[PDB]
From a paper:
Cas2 is a universal Cas protein found in all types of CRISPR-Cas systems, and plays a role in new spacer acquisition during the adaptation stage of CRISPR-Cas immunity. Overall, the structural features of XaCas2 were similar to those of other subtype I-C Cas2 structures, including the protomer fold, the dimer interface, and the conformational state. The XaCas2 protomer contained an N-terminal ferredoxin fold consisting of a four-stranded antiparallel β-sheet (β1–4) and two α-helices (α1, α2), and a C-terminal segment including a 310-helix (η1) and a β-strand (β5) [Fig. 1(a)]. Although activity was observed under neutral and basic conditions, no dsDNA cleavage was detected at pH 6.0, consistent with the suggestion that the XaCas2 structure crystallized under acidic conditions was in a catalytically inactive conformation. Together, the functional and structural analyses indicate that XaCas2 is a metal- and pH-dependent non-specific dsDNA nuclease, and support the hypothesis that subtype I-C Cas2 proteins undergo a pH-dependent conformational change to allow metal-binding prior to catalysis.
Data collection and refinement statistics are summarized in Table I. The root mean square deviation (RMSD) of the Cα atomic positions between the two XaCas2 structures was only 0.07 Å, indicating that the two structures were essentially identical. We hereafter describe only the 20 °C structure, which was determined at a higher resolution. The asymmetric unit contained two XaCas2 protomers forming a single dimer with pseudo-two-fold symmetry, 175 water molecules, and three acetate ions. In our crystal structure, XaCas2 seemed to adopt a catalytically inactive conformational state, as was also true of several other subtype I-C Cas2 structures evaluated previously. The distance between the side chains of the two Asp8 residues was 11.1 Å, and no metal ion was found near the residues. Strikingly, despite the high similarity in overall structure, the two XaCas2 protomers exhibited significant conformational heterogeneity within the putative hinge regions. Without these residues, the RMSD of the Cα atomic positions between the two XaCas2 protomers was only 0.3 Å, whereas the RMSD value for residues 72–78 was 3.5 Å.
Numbering used by the authors:
A (entry chain B): 1 to 11, 14 to 85
B (entry chain A): 1 to 86
């Protein structure tokens, strides 16, 4: 399943946390913007990755939002600008 | 319909703060700023067409990007928020 992961990381140690989040996502998705990831995971993998993401961020100052994009999500996404 | 707008604005170039401010202002009446640079827009198709044009015009596509996700209805996306709510 496709889960869109949007990471709003604070601007102290934030750069490291974004690096760690990107690394944790590397095998299971694509980093489509600086802090946005299109994650393709089955439910068990998502349980695992989600836990890691929760542990890697600082929930006091960062946030994560997760969106289930559904099937045929590729026809429902438009990119404008730099890649 | 819900459209999720993700704005990746350059930090290495000047005016990014202003461009993000203008994008947020354009999204203010039809949506919610759910993260620093992410907006949930609740729009009919004509409103979306109009807003999309403004957002495209407001960014610098050489150094910024926008991604627009058509979510259908918000409930279909089973959205979860973890962490801070500034």
């Amino acid at each position: 399943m496709m889960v869109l992961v949007s990471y709003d990381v604070s601007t102290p140690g934030g750069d490291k946390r974004l690096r760690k989040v990107a690394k944790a996502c590397r095998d299971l998705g694509q980093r489509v913007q600086f802090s946005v990831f299109e994650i393709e995971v089955d439910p068990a993998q998502w349980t695992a990755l989600r836990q890691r993401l929760c542990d890697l961020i600082d929930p006091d100052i960062d946030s994560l939002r997760f969106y289930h994009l559904g099937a045929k999500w590729e026809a429902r996404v438009e990119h404008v600008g730099a890649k």
